[PDB]
Amino acid sequence: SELPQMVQQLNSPDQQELQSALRKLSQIASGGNEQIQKLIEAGALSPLVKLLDDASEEVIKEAVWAIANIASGNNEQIQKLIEAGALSPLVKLLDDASEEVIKEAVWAIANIASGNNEQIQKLIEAGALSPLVKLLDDASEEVIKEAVWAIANIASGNNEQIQKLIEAGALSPLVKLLDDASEEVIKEAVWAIANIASGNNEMKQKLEEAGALPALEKLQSHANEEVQKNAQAALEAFN
């Protein structure tokens, strides 16, 4: 309702008033693309991004949650988020002290990567690939779950982007994730590998060298029917 005042309250020194504005803003950000558009028209994005460079970890956590929800908008809305300078503060956050902040920053990056190839290129230029690949082994299964999703979306980009992903060393941790304890992680890793398997013969050669083929074949004896099917589809996409 009173969006410009809430956007103004995003600059309030009073943290109670700020968090009150952040909660209202976040509820709008998760209300779909028409609601996200209202946040954009109210000039919410720049003040929102500015909060990623804040003293309070909780304010950062709340602002990234809202950014992740805005990043789930259409390609034009994702573009407005990039223009507001969201990429650099998000990439810096992949090395943050808080695991919950990392999870949300990876979630935001995964949503940005679900946009067009120009927006995937913007993530690559902001240097998202190296810290994302680094996160493919970082303790938390929930963090890995976010990181694989981001990488799978990046892997659906053009051949130059897939090559950039391979250069950042994505293949060895992805192949190891085909034998991860979590079934959801396996499915995600298969999706990422199937996207890499889609494209030119140079990328297919790289997957074969990484050991994706026996790892995909081992999944043909997995208890889950959907995992077997996706692994077979990934091997078909390779042949």
């Binding site: 679900s114 981001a150 659906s156």
Partner: peptide, 8 residues
């Protein structure tokens, strides 16, 4: 090829 939003 497959792109997907991460939703909750």
């Amino acid at each position: 090829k497959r792109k997907r939003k991460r939703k909750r």
